């Protein structure tokens, strides 16, 4: 995150940190959607050209963590992964189309004031909220505490004209026209929106890649979560 503000305590209870074991450090962001399922970006786990092919035992996830510089005794939890599921149509060779993955925790995590799942959108909520101009929220790290930035969804023709990458219907982009940015380092983290209809938070996107911040580009691009919900449900149901 760039030019964001500190998150308040328990402001993003569905936030998940994906760590490597060696070296033990943050790899990507992620989100909690149930007591045993975590959502992230497929490129955080798989990208052949760079010899990136993590297996279940190479990683771990931290949940309920407010500070990255200190362990929070009676708040945060850590879990190992039972299995990783990469979308079968994930296209890393061209544009990261369908940049999404599901990770199943070995043991269910107990919810608390600091750990709570986010909702996945239905067609009605996606149709009403995924509109150009409407703002969403992205969380990640910079400060030592979790950072937050609110960003507007960009019109599709404008998103396409800001990059050489071919943008599919399984993607959308957000960001202000040339204060606040989501960056490549925020990959895997959630883009959420609060419903004015039931006041629940919904995860509309997953940070797929950022062209701003440390690069001279303009916007951040996100995986369209609703568009891939059928696959998500299939994996969990089966």
């Amino acid at each position: 995150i760039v030019e964001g503000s500190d998150a308040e305590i328990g402001m993003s209870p569905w936030q998940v940190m994906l760590f490597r074991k060696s070296p033990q450090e943050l790899l990507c962001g992620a989100s909690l959607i149930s007591d045993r399922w975590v959502l992230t970006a497929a490129h955080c786990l798989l990208y052949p050209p760079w010899d990136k092919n993590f297996t279940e035992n190479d990683l771990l996830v931290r949940i309920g963590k407010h500070s990255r510089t200190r362990y929070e005794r009676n708040i945060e939890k850590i879990s190992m992964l039972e299995k990783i599921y990469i979308h079968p149509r994930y296209n890393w060779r061209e544009n990261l189309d369908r940049d999404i993955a599901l990770m199943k925790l070995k043991k269910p995590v107990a919810f608390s004031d600091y750990i709570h799942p986010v909702c996945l959108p239905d067609r009605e909520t996606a149709a009403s909220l995924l509109q150009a101009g409407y703002k969403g929220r992205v969380t990640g790290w910079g400060p030592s505490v979790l950072q937050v930035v609110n960003l507007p969804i960009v019109e599709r023709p404008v998103c396409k004209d800001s990059t050489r990458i071919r943008i599919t219907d399984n993607m959308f982009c957000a960001g202000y026209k040339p204060r606040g940015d989501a960056c490549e380092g925020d990959s895997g983290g959630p883009f959420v929106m609060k419903s004015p209809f039931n006041n629940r938070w919904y995860q509309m996107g997953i940070v797929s890649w950022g062209e701003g911040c440390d690069r001279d580009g303009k916007y951040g691009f996100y995986t369209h979560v609703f568009r891939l919900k059928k696959w998500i449900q299939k994996v969990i149901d089966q």
Binding site: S5, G10, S34, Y114, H116
Partner: peptide, 29 residues
């Protein structure tokens, strides 16, 4: 998915709003 997904224990459940959420709702109007 879950019955109470998306309702934060320290906010929506305590009838409290965070510092910047109003900015999001205003963008809808």
């Amino acid at each position: 998915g879950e019955a109470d997904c998306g309702l934060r224990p320290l906010f929506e459940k305590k009838s409290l709003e965070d510092k910047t959420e109003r900015e999001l709702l205003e963008s809808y109007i």
